[PDB]
C-alpha cells in the first residue's frame, strides 16, 4: 500500500526520521516513499535517495547542494499544490505552519507533525477541516516526543472521563532546576545550559513556561475537545528553592495551570535528564502513569513515524 | 453507525461493562446495542434492558430470572450462528474459548476479549482467521487489565524494535509477598487472601506464576509476532525473604521468564496494591514505563470497552 510523503523541515528530527524511514519503508505491508524534502534552501523533489539527502544536509547545511538533483523553490502552499503527497509531514520550527496544514487538509492530504503551535492554537479548526475532507491529523511528537502520551489519550481510555492530567514535559527546566538545587544560581545554570545547547540564546520559551503551556493545551484539546477557560502560566524564574521542584502542567476540564510545583521524592513526575512523565487520572482507572524520553532526534522521529503509519492506514481521529 | 454486541460471560467484568456501555452507548457517533448476554444459566437474546439484566444477575446469580425473557440454551457455536452479532465480547473464564472465536471470526464477526488462554495459546491462528475474514481481534484487558499496555505495544511504537519488556502483572502475588514481608507465613498469607477474594480455593494460577506466564506470552506475541523458543516459569512458593519481592515477567525475542525478583525500592516495578507496571525497552526510546491498575471490574471493563470501540471502527491489527 504505496504512500507518497513530503517532509517539511530537515533538522535533527527530519534527518533522524529519514534514517527510520529507510530502515522501515516496508512495514505492515505498506510502502513509504518520500517524494520531497524541504528546508529553507528550497525543496527537492523526485526520485532522490533518502539517505543521500540526509548525508548532503548533514555535511553541507543545505539540501540545495544535492548532487544529481534539482531544487525547486516552493512556498508552503506550492509544495502542497505542486507535489501533491498523500501525507505532509511537518518537522520544522515554523510557528505559523497551520496555513500550510489548511491547504493540505483542504485537498484531502493528511498531516503528521512534531510542531506544537499549530496544534495548540488551531486544533478545532484543523480537525473540522480534516473531517470535512476525509483526511487525518496526527501530532504525537508535539508532547513528550516519542513517548506515546497522545496515542494513549486519543485512541485509548475510550470509555473514560479524564479528571485531570499532571505532566512534566520540559527537560530544559528540569536541568536548570536540578542545577539550582545542586548549588548553582538561576543565571549560572541558564548560562551552563546555553553552553550545552539545551537552552537557546533567548531561553524564554523553556524558562517562562511557554513550551510547557503549548503542550498542556494540546493535552487539554485531546482530553476535552475544547480550549480552556481558565489559564495560568508561570515559569521558573522566581523559584528560590529548587529541590524536588519541577515545572508541572496541570490540566483539567476547562483549566490549565503550568507552574513550578514541589514533589515528594517518590512522585512519578520527579523525573531527571531527558525524561518526561504524565499522570492521567480517570473515573474508572484512577491514575495511569506514562514515562519516557521527551526529546532527541531518534526519540522524536519515533513518534512522527508512528503517526505516519497511522495516516497511511487512515486511523480515525476520535478525539 | 450501529453495532450489535454479544456479551459472553456476565461476572464482575461483564456487569461493570454493562454499566459503562449504558453510560456511553452513543459515543464517537457509534451506537452500541447489546443483543445477547450469556452466562452458565443460558443466553438472553432480544430487547432486554441492559441495566435490568445486570440488576437481575447481581441479585439472583442468573440470567434466567429476568422478567419477560426466557433463556436459550445455546452452545457457543449456536449462539454465534443464531444471534449473529457484529462483535462478540468474551468476558468469561472459559479456557477453551478459542473454539468459539474460530466460529465467530469464520463469519466475519470481530472478537474482543479479556480472557487470556485463547490469546496466549492461539494468537497466530486467530489473527490469520481474522485477516482472512475481514475481522479484528482485540484483547486489551488480558494484560494489565484496563491499563493500556496492549494499545501501546500494538498500535504505537510502530517504528520500534522491542528489545525487552519487564512487567509486574499479578496483584495477588504482590499481596502475598507484602504479607510475608510483614511477618506472615506463606500459608497464612494465602489463607487471608482467599478470605478476601484475592485468590481462589485452588490459588495455583496466581501462586505458581501461570497467570503471569500467560500474560508474558501475550506480550511476546504482540512484540515479535511468534511464540517464544524458551520458557521459564517459577512461582513464589520458595520465597523466604519477601521484602521488596515481586513476581516479574521478562520478555525478549524468543524468550519469556516469570520469576520472583528482589527489587530496589526505586525500581518502577515495585508496585503496591492493585498496581501493575511495565518497562518497555526499545532501540530509539530506551525505557518507556507504563503503570496502572491491573484488576477490578470497572478497571477491566474499561479496557474491554475501548476494544469494543476499536472493533466497531475497524482499527487495524498491525501486530
Ligand atoms: N528535537 C527535539 O527533541 C524535539 C523537537 N520538536 C519539534 O519538532 C520540530 C523540529 O525540531 P528539530 O529537528 O530539533 O529543530 P531544528 O531547528 O534542528 O530543525 C528545524 C528545521 O525546520 C526548518 N525550517 C524552519 N522554518 C522553516 C521554513 N519557514 N521553511 C522551510 N524550512 C524551515 C529548518 O530549516 P534549515 O535546516 O533550512 O534551517 C530545519 O531544517 C520543531 O517544531 C520542534 O519544536 C518536538 C519534540 C522534541
Ligand atoms: N476481575 C479482574 O480484575 C480481571 C479479570 N480478567 C479476566 O476477565 C474474565 C472475566 O473475569 P471476572 O468477571 O472477574 O470473572 P467471574 O468469575 O466474575 O465471571 C466469569 C463469568 O464467565 C461465565 N462463564 C464461565 N464459563 C462459562 C461458560 N462455559 N459458558 C458461559 N459462561 C461462562 C460465568 O458464568 P456464571 O456467572 O453463570 O458462572 C461468569 O458469568 C476472566 O477470563 C478473567 O481472567 C482479566 C483481567 C482482570
Ligand atoms: Na508524544
Ligand atoms: Na491492558
Numbering used by the authors:
A (entry chain B), B (entry chain A): 1 to 319
Excerpt from the paper describing this PDB structure:
Homoserine dehydrogenase (HseDH, EC 1.1.1.3) is a key enzyme in the biosynthetic pathway from aspartate to homoserine (Hse), which is a common precursor for the synthesis of three amino acids, methionine, threonine and isoleucine in plants and microorganisms.
The model of the dimer contained the ordered residues (1-319) in each subunit, two NADPH molecules (see below), five 2-methyl-2,4-pentanediol (MPD) molecules, two Na atoms and 212 water molecules. No cofactor was present during crystal growth, but this molecule may have originated in the E. coli cells and was then retained throughout the protein purification. On the other hand, the mass of NADP was not detected in P. horikoshii HseDH. These results demonstrate that the molecule bound to P. horikoshii HseDH is NADPH. The electron density corresponding to the NADPH bound within the nucleotide-binding site of P. horikoshii HseDH was very clear, enabling us to place the ligand with reasonable accuracy. By contrast, the C2 phosphate group (O1X, O2X, and O3X) of the adenine ribose is tightly held at its position through interactions with the side chain and backbone N atom of Arg40, the side chain of Lys57, and via a water molecule (W4), the backbone O atom of Gly61. The C2 phosphate is tightly held in position through five surrounding hydrogen bonds in the wild-type enzyme. Given that no substantive difference in the domain organization of the two enzymes was found, these observations suggest that the larger number of interactions around the C2 phosphate of the cofactor strengthen the affinity of wild type HseDH for NADP, making the binding too tight to utilize NADP as the cofactor. The two nearly identical subunits (root-mean-square deviation (r.m.s.d.) = 0.35 Å) were closely associated mainly through hydrophobic interactions around α14, β14 and the C-terminal region (residues 314–318) in both subunits.
